[PDB]
Amino acid sequence: MGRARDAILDALENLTAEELKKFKLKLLSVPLREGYGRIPRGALLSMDALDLTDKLVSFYLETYGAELTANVLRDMGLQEMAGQLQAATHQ
Amino acid sequence: MGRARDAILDALENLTAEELKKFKLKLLSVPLREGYGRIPRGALLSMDALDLTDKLVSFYLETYGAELTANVLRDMGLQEMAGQLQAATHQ
Amino acid sequence: MGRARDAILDALENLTAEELKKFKLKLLSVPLREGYGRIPRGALLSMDALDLTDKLVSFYLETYGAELTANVLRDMGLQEMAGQLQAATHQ
Amino acid sequence: MGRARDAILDALENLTAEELKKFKLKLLSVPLREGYGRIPRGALLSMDALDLTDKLVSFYLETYGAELTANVLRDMGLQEMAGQLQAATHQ
Amino acid sequence: MGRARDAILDALENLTAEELKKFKLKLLSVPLREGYGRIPRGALLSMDALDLTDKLVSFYLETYGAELTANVLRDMGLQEMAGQLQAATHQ
Amino acid sequence: MGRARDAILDALENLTAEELKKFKLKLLSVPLREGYGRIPRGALLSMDALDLTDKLVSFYLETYGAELTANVLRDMGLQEMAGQLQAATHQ
Amino acid sequence: MGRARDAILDALENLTAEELKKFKLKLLSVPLREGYGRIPRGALLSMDALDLTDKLVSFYLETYGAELTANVLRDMGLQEMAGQLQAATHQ
Amino acid sequence: MGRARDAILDALENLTAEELKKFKLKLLSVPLREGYGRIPRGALLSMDALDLTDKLVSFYLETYGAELTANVLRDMGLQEMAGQLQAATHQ
């Protein structure tokens, strides 16, 4: 159901351009799950909101991506929209 | 009949630079018609008066855009010029 | 005929600087017309006699503005010049 | 019903420019709710009345923002307009 | 009547360069009909607006392609021009 | 003979900073000529004395600009320098 | 007599960089002649003042380009330089 | 318990505008604690009553700030309200 992926595209939409930069720095820091890794910075600092979707969704499981998304957001994004995603994330 | 689109360009002209910022914020809150949606904040906050035309006119119907224009204006802009457009809006 | 707007500029001219402050305060209290609203105090308390014209004239109809003008004046300003405006207001 | 957000825009309208500065300082101090946090000072001290809204509303739960609103106001704002929002806040 | 294909060439003409990248990402996620498949990522990200026509039109039925076109557009593109195509798509 | 344009630059010189604001407001109201138009308020309110010369002279005919100059001045500027320009204006 | 094309290059020279963006938006809205068309937006919003000559001159009949140039300019550019071109345009 | 900081905001409230200027001067003279320092005059002379709270509280420990407050006050402020703070200061 790769569709729920798009719903994650709207995650970076409700946020401002200023906010975007911040999300990057905090991505690396977040606690990850075993059997997974981190993404090399080179492209990450560049990769736009969308680039953070195609590579993100592929790099991280979709079911697992949804959960991972919530974390970072409610921790730094701190937006009511963060939940907006969860609403449709599950189903 | 694209031309009338230009007439809208003159709507943001009679308003002060101060007002502009306000108009943006309220744009999101206004009630929309079914079969349509909102515009991502990213570009919107940047997009100047002009940008708010090229993307607005394309995003929203031109016939329907005219009407939409009036709403926001007479609700916040509250300028006599608001009618000025309606004068040229219809024809 | 935005010209008649100027004549208003001169309404605030025959009045003293002390008078000005007073005019501001009362402006809020006056009975308005449906399909019209009030102006946020922020700018208003700052906005000078001139600012009370550019924004005033824009916010309120010019034809209707002339009338609204007479009211406040003859109610607080109480100046023989109040009528001086009406002289040119109509035409 | 994000709409009720605008109603909050009018909250900062009835207050003076002087008042504004005060509101900022007190915002930090107010007792908050778990699962939430405070906004980084940098932008806050700059962010205007409208900047407060767009960020405030997003940073805080609209339903919950309405409540949070009342607190600060009736505590420092101390204005009759405070309740003015409430009457509309609920619905 | 491969002609209607060219009409789709214009679908990507009214959209901005910025928009183009967005369309790509969404293409994959869209619900497809049985008896068909998806296009391999590699070329897809490179393939220009024109490349998305030659390969698209061939990969997808022309009749069926027209419809498929509408979907993606009115869902993400959200442009009044989307209908402009349907206008000629049928004939 | 673009040079005569400079002489206009000196028009805004003999006038105080307070005066400048006034000139802006009255500019819009003046009776214009055909084939021409008014200048959008946006920039105009910002545009300094200099900005009112580079854009002014370009917007309005130089020959015709000189004449237009005198009008506004003697009507509101009300300065002896007003004629000082007409001196070098004609030639 | 290609040369006259160059004279057009000078048209976009007397205008500011701010103005340029504007000219773009209007270009599409202007009434065209039968047996002619419009230019796809993609390149247009990118194409510089120069790009608006090479493609413009080629896309539009030179003799016909001159006339077309006048329209847009005097309608939006609103400059005395507009005619400057016409002076040399004809010959 | 940053809240206690606010109570300090009230310290400068009961005092007149004249007093304020005095408080400033004497702030530099008072004996300080090791592991601490003074605040540069530039901002300090400007910084209003509220500015002497945000920067004061951050600059000086809150627990330690409360004490420091009493000192200066009962020495120059010499007001009954001085103790009024200690009432809330402790707890």
Added chain:
Amino acid sequence: MGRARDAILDALENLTAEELKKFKLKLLSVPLREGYGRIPRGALLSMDALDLTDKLVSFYLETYGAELTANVLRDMGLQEMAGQLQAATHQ
């Protein structure tokens, strides 16, 4: 344990925009540890509070970065928040 790096992000949060510039200047002057160096000014004058973190943390040891942090702060920052980091810096 990268994370603690983030905690530093909050160090530059409680400080004002004015402060920030200052911090930059002092950074160069602080006594350093052998087997380390300084950062080229170019980026260091542009690099925002965030840029400082990403480059600082990488350029300087994390465990060692924490200590270094406290230094500059208590010396110039002179804030009670300075200690706030420490309390969490260790763990």
Added chain:
Amino acid sequence: MGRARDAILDALENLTAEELKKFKLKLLSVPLREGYGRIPRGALLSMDALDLTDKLVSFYLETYGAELTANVLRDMGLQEMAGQLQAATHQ
């Protein structure tokens, strides 16, 4: 003797930032020499004091540039430093 060019760099150095803008406007209006032309405004309005130098010099004869410099300065710059250049200009 390219070097003499540098001296001109110091011409724009003794002048204030406020002055710079002024100099720009006047540049266009100055009488020129046959076998030479003017510089397009687009860049000129942006080009800094230095950008003015590199382009000025290349565009205008160095020997002839020195003279040209004096004119504009004594006419508008109206500074004693104007002669300061002449002292080194010749040799």
Added chain:
Amino acid sequence: MGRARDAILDALENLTAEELKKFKLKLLSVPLREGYGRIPRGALLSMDALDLTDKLVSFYLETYGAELTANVLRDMGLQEMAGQLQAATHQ
């Protein structure tokens, strides 16, 4: 020998704040030398005593500025200090 300029700074020091205003008004009315001009009022009325030094000194010759100083002073300033400057003016 720029230094002698400073001595002029002390010229406006022995005079009261009331005096300052007067000096301004009379500056324009004084007989000037050929090959020199007057200073635009805008800045002048604002430009403080210091501003009158930096701009004056640069505007007028230093050797010539000294003489010019004496004139205005002994004619309006009418102070024994007027000669005080001359004491150091020459050398």
Added chain:
Amino acid sequence: MGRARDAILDALENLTAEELKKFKLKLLSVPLREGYGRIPRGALLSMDALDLTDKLVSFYLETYGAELTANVLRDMGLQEMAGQLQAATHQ
């Protein structure tokens, strides 16, 4: 005497990268001699400054090339360097 060709290589050297693009557009419009033709745009727009030399020199007579060079430059390039080439072009 091919050599003089290399000297033309230095023509495109003293010019900026921005300038380059301009030179291209103009080349086509220049009045050519009889018994000679124009170069197809395809390669010309790509062909670098070095490509504009190998192809140019071969396409145009070397003796006649030098002359042709001066024209385009002194008409658009408008650089004192233009003559620099001539001085060497001849011999």
Added chain:
Amino acid sequence: MGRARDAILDALENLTAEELKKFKLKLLSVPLREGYGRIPRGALLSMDALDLTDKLVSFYLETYGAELTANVLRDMGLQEMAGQLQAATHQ
């Protein structure tokens, strides 16, 4: 021993905001040493107390900068804090 530079930072701290403007003006006037020069006014007039430090220190020898500091201060600053720096300048 870079650090000593910081001490110079504190120099501009004990002085008022009014004082600052003065220091600027009298800086250019001071007698300089061989193998050294003055700083262009542009940035200088802007450059704040801190900007003066970063650029001053780099522009002027540190050992020699300390001395230079004393001169200006005791000659215009005329503050007891002037010597305060010296006590720490030497070491």
Added chain:
Amino acid sequence: MGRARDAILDALENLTAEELKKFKLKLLSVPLREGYGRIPRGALLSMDALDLTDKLVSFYLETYGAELTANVLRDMGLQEMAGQLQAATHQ
């Protein structure tokens, strides 16, 4: 045990895209060992981070490559990650 080579691939991963260009230049300058040499610039400047691994690891002994790696990094890269490699480099 080629594998260790891959770990090197991670070295260029924690560094920014901007950093990369810097690493290149330094590579040439570093002190080398006898029985080896340098790599011809042609490819090197182009060769990406990955290219700097395949060619590097082959051009330089793996065991010896690890050492060489550390050198350049701790000298220019100056990153805490530099040690990160050493951790795994040895084994």
Added chain:
Amino acid sequence: MGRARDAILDALENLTAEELKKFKLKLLSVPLREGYGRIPRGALLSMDALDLTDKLVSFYLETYGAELTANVLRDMGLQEMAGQLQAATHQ
């Protein structure tokens, strides 16, 4: 001993981004030694601080480059760091 080249890299490090543009302009004007030449402006204006090094060092002798460096710096750079290089330059 190409190593001394790197030290020249550190020459551009202590200078601000603003300064950089300036260095470029002057590089051309500086007196040169026979048997050598100047560098074409094209790349030069683009070429960054680093690009300046790689090309500079190769374009000019390293021994001779060291000296050349000093000139430009102490003449325009005018920084105490200029000597800093000489400290390592010689050896």
